Amino acid sequence: DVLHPYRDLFPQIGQRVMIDDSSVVIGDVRLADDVGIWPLVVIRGDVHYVQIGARTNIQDGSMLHVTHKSSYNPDGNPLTIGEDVTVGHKVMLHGCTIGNRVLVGMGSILLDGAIVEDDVMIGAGSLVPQNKRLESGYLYLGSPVKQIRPLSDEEKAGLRYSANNYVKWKDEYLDQ
Amino acid sequence: DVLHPYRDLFPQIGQRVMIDDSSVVIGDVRLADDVGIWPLVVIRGDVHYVQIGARTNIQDGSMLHVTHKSNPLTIGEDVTVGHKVMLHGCTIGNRVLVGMGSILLDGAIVEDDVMIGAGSLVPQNKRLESGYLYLGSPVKQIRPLSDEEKAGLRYSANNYVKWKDEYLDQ
Amino acid sequence: DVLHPYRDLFPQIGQRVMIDDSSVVIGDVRLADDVGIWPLVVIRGDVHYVQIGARTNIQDGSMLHVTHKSSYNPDGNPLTIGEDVTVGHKVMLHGCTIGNRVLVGMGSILLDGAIVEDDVMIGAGSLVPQNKRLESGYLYLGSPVKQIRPLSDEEKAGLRYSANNYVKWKDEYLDQ
Ligand SMILES: [Zn+2]
Ligand SMILES: [Zn+2]
Ligand SMILES: [Zn+2]
């Protein structure tokens, strides 16, 4: 009872996907293999689609939506998330684009049109302005975010570690 | 069951009101016609009442409460309360857009035709002058809204009323 | 059904504890007497435990989790909260330690390793960095927080009243 339709739009689920019973997934939401949706999360893909790549976790209390229809976006815009992405607790993602191996710090807000490239870390409580592009391989922090410094190889490997740890984490629940 | 009581208080609902099955509305909460309460929203009107005007949307993940007595929450018509907004014992006029993730504190007063940027914080008792854009934590008055932006405030509410009806028809 | 087990770990509940039907409590979560868990709250004590002291309120929309397992903390770390603590609406607590008689302003984020001593007030929308220690008897505000000023005797008394009032409000809901 966690998946809901919007007109004739319904979530498409891959293999080993975990969606907490307390969460709400509405409309055109594509969840790739090993995606884990934790407690009290809302993902709404009504005016456009939401695409979440393999081995990506959407942590507790996050809210994911697409860009609404307006003069700037007559048909709105989708929310796209790559593979091995760690979306922290209470993160707000709105019609943005996130690449692969990205860690979005808990409590952050990513606005419409924002584009986050691969291997990027966003500190907790950050705000990414509309249409802002976050260059690959850097640490961003602040409200609004500022490019702080490039990530070390160890840090970049940690991005993969985070995604893998959460894949094992959701499997432990699908196992219970 | 999305409506719940508090003592002798229970929510009063107008016409064509949508309340997502995952939301929680408690106590003296008054929702006017065409109000739309989206997923995972909590509106608690126990310590005091919560009044929401016609054609106003309360988006996903918002949390609405009143001042802790030791002040009611009043929202006007055609108001767009963004996703994850925290409203606490404040007063909001008509045609106001509260940017997603914002926090409006006790005693705050927002006049008509105002836009608050996403992730902003409006301090206790702060009054936001009509016709301006405010943003920041705490908010700062940035600039007056253009006529197109004001029309945008109306469109935002209009669009969400249609959006609400879309779900009700299902 | 608000209590859920994580493997053979299950919440331990004291006397007169209120847990809203819309909330989610998972795993090793220990709630002392008179604790009140309000609507849409998630408390997850899976990799480690969450310990909440007596007469403490966890307000609507809060998200409580423990420090994740990592090369730094192989078995993770617990989230510990003292007695007479007021955790404001939408607060994010993550593997930190909070003393007694503390008020955490709504919308705040407290990160891993943070330590909040007794009789402290944190303003709404604040962010407490990892491992930061907040000295007893002061007001902290900001993102990241800064020590603003000492709390007045009136304010220190208010911390007690805040907790007391929420215990009363908790009971009103329990009796109905
Ligand atoms: Zn939206
Ligand atoms: Zn409150
Ligand atoms: Zn966590």
Swiss-Prot record, chains A, C:
GO cellular component: cytosol; protein-containing complex
GO molecular function annotations of the record: identical protein binding; zinc ion binding
S-S pairs: none
Cited InterPro entries: Hexapep, LbH_gamma_CA-like, Transf_Hexapept/Carb_Anhydrase, Trimer_LpxA-like_sf
Family membership noted in the UniProt record: Belongs to the gamma-class carbonic anhydrase family.
The name this protein goes by in its record: Protein YrdA
Species of the source: Escherichia coli (strain K12)
Gene designation: yrdA
